Every structure is written in structure tokens, then in C-alpha cells.
């Protein structure tokens, strides 16, 4: 089976100023996250902006990090949505260019009930041959998959776990208490994530770790090795970073940071907007605090 | 320019068992909304499930609806998302197919900023040249449009009004206050609408009026004349209903009562599923105590 | 039985500038309430800071009320509390120094349940020989007492009434429809009370009252005799005073609003704070505005 | 200077059947958890009722502990309020019955801002020399202080440490990086307070600690000590008791559970009400299943 543990960026979507995709800052990208010691890459997820890219454009960019990365590092696509239907069709290209796994958000917008969510992924994980990574962010989702849900569809076939995106780490706890041994439970909320491994869950996926994958690495590293000094040390260097990548909505932020540090250009696509001129020092100081810049 | 105003269905879409759209079911539905008072209706929003239709059946129900309506009412197109290039595609196909105007919904799950939401909208009005209804409903989207760009907005040709769905009484009156006199606020919270449009607002898109066209259609004349006697009889007959319809998230519940008044068939497509049997009695009991059963 | 209806401003307990009481300045205000067409005051409520007034501050701002206002006004004192034993002992203080009924707060900070709520008021009522109106104020007490619960409590002796300090407007029609005769639903959002009373409520108990006692009289005689549109232009002409008299936790814009006045002078005690220099400006300007200035 | 760490149950006040203190349980209770290795006790704090006792019970409860635990652990006395002027006079009175510190709520229910939660604090500890420990607990006060209110404070002569109960995590990281040497940072939510005190944390105010102070005292010690496998082996033991107990409003569950082990009798006071029956055999299976029945 397919592996995923300890550190996985949910990497941007590099573009050029006019918003169209730079694949050559994305290879750049991809090498450089392998060799600062990144374990494994979410290709267009929420941080890769995967609403406003166009379907040849999602499966482009899978294909391209699916070819970059060589087989080096797993590759994991973001291949969800609202629609059960669009959601598999997705699914399906992923796996025809050769990605690892898909990640899949429950659906936002339209408030499935808690069966609906269940019936939702079954049906993924059923209709395509290919591991399923669960995605619960009710913060931008508004639907919640409980913790029930979560462990009914760790009994599906094909579904290996599920990123928490929810910072609460006693609903963490529980699911790390109950998980089936194959069911891994990640991060997606990067300020609790050390928490969240410490307590026996299996990674991070993060947005921290696109401008930090080497500390970012250490930190998985020490944190699934219980090893809680040099997690924490870590940690605390990284907690404005945590913070203020967050200063507006995530990827804004870490896309402006990228481009301070010189690996992309300024392209983002509405309805999202270049990070506010008004965050700009602090996000700076941020970064200079980290020795990024 | 176009007129909307008073009672405006957001009309479900009504599919056969496996999902498929039914047509025939639709254009009935049409006509007896027409019979009944029904003074426009939106066409593929939220309650026409538009997060699981293709574009070509999201074209085709507004190409339904504008052909059979004959141009006895209007009829609003659903043409929004968090994309900004999706959302003039579809409004350039809303246009094509002879709809009145757009209900744009704020962009859910990416979450943008103010100024976001601002250069969204803008560039939707700007790019088609058809009304442009905003959509303003946070529990679904997270993002809120704040009423100073709300109002903002209200300068830019085209944006002929806002439906305020986060039913916040306050928030309405002060729209209404700074409102231009060409931009009209209608309720999107059933529950409130009653309240919003006593205060000066312009009608109500709504659920309720799905099953009770006439006495909807006889709530908003009576509160937008000031009735306000008039106007709370026939709320109160119905506050039951506006409560059981969301028992489930719309549009579970309005599509299940309008199964059970033989109006339409079962059909609903995942992630949504049929009203929980759990439900049944509950809603049908508010169904019969207001004469609709 | 006593009759609360209309305008029933939450008034201020003015102080010296060490925070002791200034009784002159009380019974000046009463006067002034009277002769500018208040119905009835809610006397060391919340806005009389009963959380920082000795038991006999609390009781002789009371019996200063009562004597002062010479019964043509009624006087309902607050006398509640998170404490069942203290609850009955104010209550019984209330009586005995004339009050016609006391405002009875749900429990804040110990989250009763709703058994808990119900035996809490039931056992007040049954104390003291003396009305009731009980308060609901989530925003405050965390704890939120159902409409279910508040309709058995109107069952009880003594209980006349309650008010809903929520803004929640839905909540508000379903216990006007539930409500018995005897039983009175009462404002205490004054940015949505236009909205309750029109659907047939009976009477705000508000803040903004304290500094346009004459506008809120008017307000609140023509919102209960249905008439809208006399309601709804006062109401939007108060519209930005409704909020900023909340741009720091009330009451401290309020008393400050009256020290601008020239109605009191600037006492108020710790953890509360005079109202905020930074605030002024806007504050004063709502006041300007509204003719109060 | 007093040093508290550890495991630090909020003990409850065993009360007889009709609501009297009884102080034979109380004592016998202080003896058992010395025993079984509790480091320090919280007394007629949140989880002590404090709310419902008299001054002279709310003494009369310190004093008490403070003679029986004999010096053997620390005492801490609960003192806060939302008045400044009580809290100085209970905390009078706790140093007079030889208290080692107290323990200061922020103010609940008049939602004072960040400066007047700042001057209050301050001026408790000023008036009285003795030890003050902070506690936020937002959830049931509304007003939350900020760290960087809680940071201010740490700059005052006597304010020794905080309890934080809000279970956020970044914040009590953020807390814990920023506070100077001498401020000591205690968890106050026992479903997170493992990974408060892995970060860098000092203790745990608990409730679970009063039904397994045992079990409790070796999880703070290891999780003090940074051996996060022990720590987590313990937590994971106690999870469905750290949620249970909680089924209801503390101390209505823990207070219940200790009935059941034969510690106390069933005495608790109005607005608070005995575990619902509902509830019984939930907290029964987590008691049994912790070995505890």
C-alpha cells in the first residue's frame, strides 16, 4: 500500500502574473520541497486553488508533479467537491496520470446530512481504484463530518484516512483512539499539528511547510518519533509563521511569501487577490523571523 | 429595466428516480406558481440544486423556465460559484437562453477577502449584460459580504439588487436606509422575510413559497403595503412550515413535501438525499395544519 | 394585575465620580423619563450595573424609584441572579420597598440546564408575592432558556411575561403565537425591537430609551398599533444610535452618551470603564445626528 | 514563593442531601486525594459551586481545607467575581484563613473590555498580598482576555499564572513562549490540558482529577516531564470520562459520579440540579470503564 506519513505540503499553484500556470516554477518547486526533505505533496487542494482552475488545468497540474516528482515522493491529488458525480470524474483523471491518492473535501456549500457525506465518499472510493484520503474543514466547508462518519468510512475499502482540519484536539484524540490500524489521521490545521502527532496521529498537511518544508520535515520527524523537545522547539520557531500566513485567507498569504522569497510570480486568480499591502510587514517579519528572507 | 418584487420562489428542480431531470414536472410546476401568485422565480439557485446539475442541464432548466413562462413573470438564473471566469461563463449562457436576470451567490469555500468579493461581482456585471441579483448567505458560504461592500456594489452597473439570506433584522435596515432607489433587498430567511419587508425591503426568495405560492405570494403584497395585520395572519399560519422545511438542509425538506403533494417525484442527487424517514411525520404534519395536505 | 407596555427604557444608575450613588441626578432622570412619555423603568437591571451595587445600593435605588415616580409609572426592579437563595432574597427586598414586579435574568456563568432554569424561576415566583418578568440574554449568561421552557414558566403564578433580549426574530413570532394571554413578550434588542412588536410583541425594555425616551414612547406606540410607517421612521432615524450606544459592552456608551448630555456625571465601577477615548467621536456624532446633541 | 504544579483538582463542596455543606466528606475527600498524589486543590472554584454559597460558607469551605490539608499541599482559593470590589473582599478573606493564593475568574455577564479586565486584576492583586492565579474561561464569562491582556498582567507583583480553559491550543502555545519565567500557564480544559502541559505548560486544573486524582497526577507528571508515551497512555484511558463528565454543565456529572463512588452525598444547589437520569448510565460506563466502579 501507499505510505503517506510525516510532512505534506498542500503546495500552491505557481502562476504567471496574468494568472496562468508556470509549470516551470512548479518543477522548481517540487525539486526543491524533495530535496529540503518534504515526504509527500497535496497537489491541487484548497491551497492550489483548485476553484478557479479549469478541469484540463487540474489534471495538467497532477500530471506534471505526477512526471516531476519521478516517483520520488508520493503525490497526492485534490480531486473533491460538492457533486458526487464531479468529484469521481475528477478521481478518475487523477488516477489516469498516475497520482497516488486523492484527497477529498467533504462537500461545502450545499450541507449534505451526515449519510449524505457517508454515501458521498462510498461512492468515490467505489467508482475509482485508488486510495482516498478524507478532507473535514468545516470552517470553509460548513458541514462537519463527525467523528462517527469518519470511522464508518475507515471500514470502506480503499478510504486510508482522513485530514483534520479542525485544530480540536480532543476530537483528534478520539479518532486517533478508534482508528483502524491501516486509517491514518493528518493534520490540516498547521498552529495544533504537533498536538495532533504527538498523540499518535501519522503527519501534517500543511501550508507552513511551503515556505519552511525542511523545519517543517524535522518537526513531523520528531513529533512521530515522540520526541517532544525538538518537535516543540521547532514548533515555537515557526508559530508567527503559523499565524501569519493565515493573515488573510490561506493561500493569499503564503503565495505573497513565495514570491518574496523569489519562487513564483504574483498570479492568483479571483476571487481571490494578492495578499493586502496592509499584512505585507508582517507577513515579512514573519518570514525574516524565520530566516526565509 | 426589469422589475422583480414581491414573492419569488426559489424553485426546486425536479428529477426522476436515478436524478434525471423532469421537465414536464417543471413546466406544470411553472404554470401552477403562475395560477397561484407567484411573482417571479429563481431558476437553478441553491433550491435547484445548481452544485450537481452540468452546465448543460443548469442551461436547459433556465431555457425550461424562460420558455414556458412566456414572459407572464421573470425569470432569475442561478449563474454564481467561487469562480470568477465559471461565473461569467454561466451568466454568458443565462443570458443566451433569455433569462431576466442572475442571482449571484457569493463565492463559498475559497473564502475572499471584501475587496474579493467586491472585484467578483464587479467583473460578473461587467462582462454580461443581464441584472445581476448578489446573494449574500454566510451559513452556507462562510464568507460574509459586508453591507459597506454590499452597498459599494449598489454603485456598479448592472447590480440591481442583494438577497439577504443571514435573516439579521438589523443588517436589513441598514440596507435598506443606505440602499440607492435602484437597488432592491430582498429576504432569503423565510423566517424573517416578514420583518424585512415591513422595514422597507422588496420581496422575498423563498423557500416556503415552493408549497405555499399563494399565501406567500399574499404575505409579501400585504407587507410591502405596510399590512402589517394582514401580512403577520399569514406568517403565523405558517411558521411551522417555515421551521420543518429546514429540519433538513434545503432543499431535502421542500422536495420531499412537494413529493407527498404529488407535485413532483422523488429524485434529489448526492451528496443531498431523501428526507430522513425520521422526518416524515414532521413535516407532513405541518404540511396538513397548513391546508396544503 | 400591573400593566408593562410600551417604552420601558433600562435606566442608568447615575454616580459620583468614586462611583458612589448620585440620587439627585436619579430623580431628575425619573422626571425627565416621565415628562418625555417612558411607560415604565426597569430599574438596577443590567444597565444599572446591579452587578457592582451592594444589596442595600441595589435596594435603595429601588425604593428611590418607587417613591420618586409616586406610582405614575410603574417601577419593575431587577433582582436576579445566578444564585436561587440570592435571587429570592433581592426579590424579597424589591417588595418590600414597592417595586410592581421584579426582571428576573436566567443564570449566567454556572450554565443551569433548562430543568435547572425552570425550578430556578418557579422557585422566585413562588417566594415573593410579586410579578415576574423573566430575561433571556444568551449574548450574556451563555446559558439560553428555550421558548419550550419559557412557555411552562408562563404557566406559573406570578410569571407575566419576558424579555427576549436574543434580536432573534423567529424566535420571537413563535412565542407571540404560543404565548397566553397573560403573558407578555418583551423587546430587549433594541435594533430589532421595531420587528417584534409589529408582529405583536408588547413593549421594548432598551437602552437607546435612556437618551431618546421621547422618539422610543413614539416608536413603540405606534410599532403596537400596527403602524409601520410611523414606527419604521423613527426607527431608522435611531438607527445608528441602536449601534453605537454598543460600540463598547453597554452601559458604558450609554452612560457616557448621558454625561455628554448633561444628565449625569461620569461614575461607573470597575471591571467597567469609562467609554473609550478612541470612541467618542463616534458616539457623539450618533447623538449629534439623532437631534440629541 | 508558592509553587504549584501538577495535578490540581477544582475539588467540589460535598453538600448533605439537603443542600448543607458537609464538611466530614470534605475532609475525608482532601485526606484521599493527598493520598493518592494530588498536588494541589482548587477550592470553591466554578467546579466548588461558588456561585450558590454564602460568604460565610464560601469561607467557612477554605478555612476547612486549609486547617485539614495541614501544609501538606497547596490551597487555592477561588475569590473572583464580576464586582472588583468582592473579589478584594473574599480575597481578604482567603489570606486571612491562610489561603496560599487565589484563583480570579475574569468577570462573567457585564463583559467588561480588555482594560477594565486589566484594572480589575490589578487591583485585586494590589489590595491583597497574596498570590493571584488568572483564570479565562470564556466559555462561560462571554468577555475572553486576550494574551496579550493576559501578558500585561504577568508584569504585575503578585499575578503568579493563568488557567486557561478555553482548550485552544495555539493560544496556550502562544502563552507559553511569550510568558515570563515566573508566570505559570495551567490548563483548565482536561480534554486538551496534555498537550497545554507537553507544550510547556505547568499543571492542570481538572475536573477529572476529582474522580481519578491518581491516574491524573501521573499523566501531569509525565506529560511535565516531556514523556509523551506515558502521558498519552493515561489520557487516552480517562478520554470518555474527560468527556462525560461534562454531559452536563460541571459539576453536575462529576458530582454525580462521586455519589456513585460513595464520597459524597447527592446535596447540590438550585440553579444547578442532580444528573439527569437520562445521563446516569453514560457516566456510569465511563466510571466503570476507568475502574472507578
Same mark, same amino acid.
Given at each position: 500500500?501507499?505510505?503517506?506519513? !510525516?510532512?505534506? $505540503? *498542500?503546495?500552491?499553484?505557481?502562476?504567471?502574473?496574468?494568472?496562468?500556470?508556470?509549470?516551470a516554477a512548479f518543477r522548481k518547486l517540487?525539486?526543491?520541497?524533495?530535496?529540503?526533505?518534504?515526504?509527500?505533496?497535496?497537489?491541487? !487542494?484548497?491551497? !492550489?486553488?483548485?476553484?478557479?482552475?479549469?478541469?484540463?488545468?487540474?489534471?495538467?497540474?497532477?500530471?506534471?508533479?505526477?512526471?516531476?516528482?519521478?516517483?520520488?515522493?508520493?503525490?497526492?491529488?485534490?480531486?473533491?467537491?460538492?457533486?458526487?458525480?464531479? %468529484?469521481?470524474?475528477?478521481?478518475?483523471?487523477?488516477?489516469?496520470?498516475?497520482?497516488?491518492?486523492?484527497?477529498?473535501?467533504?462537500?461545502?456549500?450545499?450541507?449534505?446530512?451526515?449519510?449524505?457525506?457517508?454515501?458521498?465518499?462510498?461512492?468515490?472510493?467505489?467508482?475509482?481504484?485508488? $486510495?482516498?484520503?478524507?478532507?473535514?474543514?468545516?470552517?470553509?466547508?460548513?458541514?462537519?463530518?463527525?467523528?462517527?462518519?469518519?470511522?464508518?468510512?475507515?471500514?470502506?475499502?480503499?478510504?486510508?484516512?482522513?485530514?483534520? %482540519?479542525?485544530?480540536?484536539?480532543?476530537?483528534?484524540?478520539?479518532?486517533?483512539?478508534?482508528?483502524? *490500524?491501516?486509517?491514518?489521521?493528518?493534520?490540516?490545521?498547521?498552529?495544533?499539528?504537533?498536538?495532533?502527532?504527538?498523540?499518535?496521529?501519522?503527519?501534517?498537511?500543511?501550508?507552513?511547510?511551503?515556505?519552511? $518544508?525542511?523545519?517543517?520535515?524535522?518537526?513531523?520527524?520528531?513529533?512521530?518519533?515522540?520526541?517532544?523537545?525538538?518537535?516543540?522547539?521547532?514548533?515555537?520557531?515557526?508559530?508567527?509563521?503559523?499565524?501569519?500566513?493565515?493573515?488573510?485567507?490561506?493561500?493569499? $498569504?503564503?503565495?505573497?511569501?513565495?514570491?518574496?522569497?523569489?519562487?513564483? %510570480?504574483?498570479?492568483?486568480?479571483?476571487?481571490?487577490?494578492?495578499?493586502?499591502?496592509?499584512?505585507?510587514?508582517?507577513?515579512?517579519?514573519?518570514?525574516?523571523?524565520?530566516?526565509?528572507?
Open positions: 500500500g501507499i505510505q503517506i506519513r !510525516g510532512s505534506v $505540503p *498542500a503546495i500552491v499553484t505557481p502562476m504567471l502574473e496574468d494568472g496562468g500556470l508556470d509549470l517540487i525539486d526543491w520541497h524533495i530535496e529540503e526533505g518534504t515526504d509527500a505533496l497535496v497537489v491541487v !487542494g484548497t491551497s !492550489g486553488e483548485s476553484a478557479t482552475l479549469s478541469v484540463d488545468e487540474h489534471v495538467l497540474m497532477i500530471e506534471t508533479a505526477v512526471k516531476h516528482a519521478a516517483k520520488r515522493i508520493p503525490i497526492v491529488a485534490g480531486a473533491g467537491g460538492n457533486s458526487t458525480t464531479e %468529484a469521481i470524474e475528477l478521481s478518475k483523471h487523477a488516477k489516469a496520470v498516475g497520482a497516488d491518492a486523492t484527497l477529498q473535501v467533504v462537500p461545502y456549500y450545499n450541507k449534505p446530512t451526515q449519510e449524505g457525506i457517508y454515501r458521498h465518499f462510498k461512492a468515490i472510493a467505489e467508482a475509482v481504484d485508488l $486510495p482516498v484520503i478524507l478532507y473535514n474543514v468545516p470552517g470553509r466547508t460548513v458541514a462537519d463530518m463527525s467523528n462517527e462518519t469518519t470511522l464508518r468510512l475507515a471500514q470502506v475499502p480503499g478510504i486510508i484516512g482522513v485530514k483534520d %482540519a479542525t485544530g480540536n484536539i480532543d476530537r483528534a484524540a478520539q479518532l486517533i483512539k478508534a482508528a483502524p *490500524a491501516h486509517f491514518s489521521i493528518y493534520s490540516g490545521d498547521d498552529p495544533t499539528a504537533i498536538a495532533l502527532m504527538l498523540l499518535g496521529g501519522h503527519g501534517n498537511i500543511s501550508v507552513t511547510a511551503n515556505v519552511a $518544508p525542511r523545519a517543517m520535515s524535522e518537526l513531523c520527524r520528531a513529533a512521530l518519533a515522540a520526541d517532544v523537545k525538538t518537535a516543540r522547539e521547532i514548533h515555537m520557531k515557526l508559530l508567527s509563521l503559523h499565524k501569519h500566513l493565515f493573515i488573510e485567507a490561506n493561500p493569499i $498569504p503564503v503565495k505573497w511569501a513565495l514570491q518574496q522569497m523569489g519562487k513564483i %510570480a504574483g498570479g492568483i486568480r479571483l476571487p481571490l487577490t494578492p495578499l493586502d499591502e496592509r499584512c505585507h510587514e508582517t507577513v515579512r517579519g514573519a518570514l525574516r523571523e524565520a530566516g526565509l528572507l
